[PDB]
Amino acid sequence: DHQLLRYLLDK
Amino acid sequence: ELTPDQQTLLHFIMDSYNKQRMPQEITNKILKEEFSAEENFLILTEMATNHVQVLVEFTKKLPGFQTLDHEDQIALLKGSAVEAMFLRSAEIFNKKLPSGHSDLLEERIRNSGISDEYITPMFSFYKSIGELKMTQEEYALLTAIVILSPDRQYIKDREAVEKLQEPLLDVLQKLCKIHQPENPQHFAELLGRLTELRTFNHHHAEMLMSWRVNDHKFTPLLEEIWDVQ
Ligand SMILES: O=C(O)c1ccc2nc(N3C[C@H]4CCC[C@@H](C3)[C@@H]4OCc3c(-c4c(Cl)cccc4Cl)noc3C3CC3)sc2c1
């Protein structure tokens, strides 16, 4: 969980 | 009366919402590809992973989201992904977006391994939604207020989400007088349809398991946001 959601949130 | 705060806020959201388009080369696949159960599912999977990204980018811009608790930021996305996805498709079917290719999109949904149990109510919902004759500004605000639901599982600071949500409800509240003084109970109708939309969370979890036991897989992004094991 989180890993890819986090990644999209930071940009 | 629409407060100046509320007019800018509103146009800012239309920015995010209009900015959310998925490329044509992707959505052209709805019309272009063979119609078989397997290709229909593949394409729904692809529109969905792409859509989730767009979703995140829209949510990110929602005022005060970027300054929320990180753990809650995730709880909201996972909490609202289905409801928000169902509203987007509702808009496609009701507004007949060219790039949504609605008739063919319906054909694909109707032959992608989903039980009749779910198809029937899904399309009842779309029909009812359309009958509200909502503007693009309303679809947009509802999506915003759905994403920022403070009643989702695992939220820590509920009240901090309320604060981000209440203004949007207020703006929608107004739009419902201002763009429809004819019918009074319009805003309340919207909210009732939200409740109805909530019921699709359970249907979608059963849909996922059926798909999975018939050896369909999703993408890593969908697997996260939908909690696929
Ligand atoms: O901006 C555009 O132009 C545009 C055009 C078409 C389009 N189609 C979109 N979809 C089509 C589909 C209809 C609901 C929203 C999802 C994104 C996508 O979800 C398909 C779906 C659903 C689903 C369905 Cl079938 C109905 C409603 C909601 C969902 Cl999540 N469940 O699983 C899946 C994938 C098979 C794993 S977004 C979009 C934007």
Side-chain angles (χ1 to χ4, degrees), chain A, chain B residues 1-132 134-229:
Chain A
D1 48 9
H2 319 162
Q3 295 247 118
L4 309 177
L5 295 170
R6 257 289 92 67
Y7 170 84
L8 291 174
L9 289 168
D10 311 337
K11 261 133 82 87
Chain B
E1 203 71 63
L2 197 64
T3 285
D5 302 292
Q6 294 175 342
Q7 175 51 84
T8 51
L9 174 47
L10 176 277
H11 181 21
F12 169 88
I13 287 200
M14 289 324 90
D15 258 70
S16 313
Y17 203 76
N18 292 311
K19 168 265 175 262
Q20 100 161 191
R21 290 288 173 285
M22 313 222 307
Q24 214 197 216
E25 83 274 332
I26 293 172
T27 54
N28 287 351
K29 296 184 182 138
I30 294 157
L31 160 72
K32 178 168 107 144
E33 304 304 333
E34 63 159 355
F35 296 81
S36 65
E38 189 51 83
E39 183 61 17
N40 291 348
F41 175 91
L42 248 62
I43 286 167
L44 294 182
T45 298
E46 201 184 329
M47 293 316 106
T49 4
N50 281 285
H51 183 58
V52 167
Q53 293 178 62
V54 158
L55 222 67
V56 163
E57 253 295 336
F58 169 76
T59 304
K60 278 173 64 165
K61 303 193 195 204
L62 295 192
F65 185 83
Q66 217 92 231
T67 40
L68 284 171
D69 199 290
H70 276 28
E71 194 167 345
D72 292 334
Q73 281 185 332
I74 284 174
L76 289 173
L77 293 170
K78 295 162 81 144
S80 73
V82 172
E83 283 162 35
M85 292 173 75
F86 266 85
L87 270 176
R88 225 281 130 111
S89 64
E91 185 170 26
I92 291 161
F93 292 121
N94 298 327
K95 303 255 288 303
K96 303 294 193 170
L97 271 71
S99 56
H101 309 108
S102 39
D103 288 342
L104 300 172
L105 189 63
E106 180 159 9
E107 290 282 20
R108 296 185 186 285
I109 292 174
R110 285 180 186 278
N111 191 29
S112 57
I114 306 167
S115 185
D116 298 336
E117 271 183 296
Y118 312 123
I119 294 287
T120 295
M122 178 181 320
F123 283 91
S124 174
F125 173 82
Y126 296 138
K127 188 178 158 68
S128 283
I129 290 299
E131 276 153 11
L132 299 174
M134 294 166 75
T135 53
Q136 198 181 20
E137 301 196 323
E138 292 165 293
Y139 279 106
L141 279 164
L142 265 192
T143 302
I145 141 285
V146 162
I147 290 157
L148 299 162
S149 161
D151 324 316
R152 308 294 184 198
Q153 280 229 316
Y154 312 130
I155 297 173
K156 314 228 151 300
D157 200 331
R158 262 101 142 77
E159 196 157 3
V161 184
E162 257 112 50
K163 308 214 176 151
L164 299 164
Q165 194 193 48
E166 279 196 21
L168 299 162
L169 287 146
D170 291 10
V171 170
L172 175 58
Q173 159 99 225
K174 292 204 183 181
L175 266 285
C176 291
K177 274 95 140 205
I178 297 170
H179 270 22
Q180 194 172 348
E182 302 98 346
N183 165 26
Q185 306 230 15
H186 180 59
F187 179 62
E189 292 169 28
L190 268 67
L191 302 185
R193 294 309 170 193
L194 281 208
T195 299
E196 182 176 336
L197 191 65
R198 196 104 39 219
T199 63
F200 290 99
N201 294 287
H202 176 99
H203 298 336
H204 185 84
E206 303 291 307
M207 275 161 66
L208 287 198
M209 287 188 305
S210 175
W211 274 324
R212 289 191 81 220
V213 296
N214 289 304
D215 191 31
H216 303 105
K217 303 213 202 221
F218 311 105
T219 65
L221 185 50
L222 293 175
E223 276 155 28
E224 259 199 47
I225 199 166
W226 288 339
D227 245 62
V228 175
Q229 51 73 36

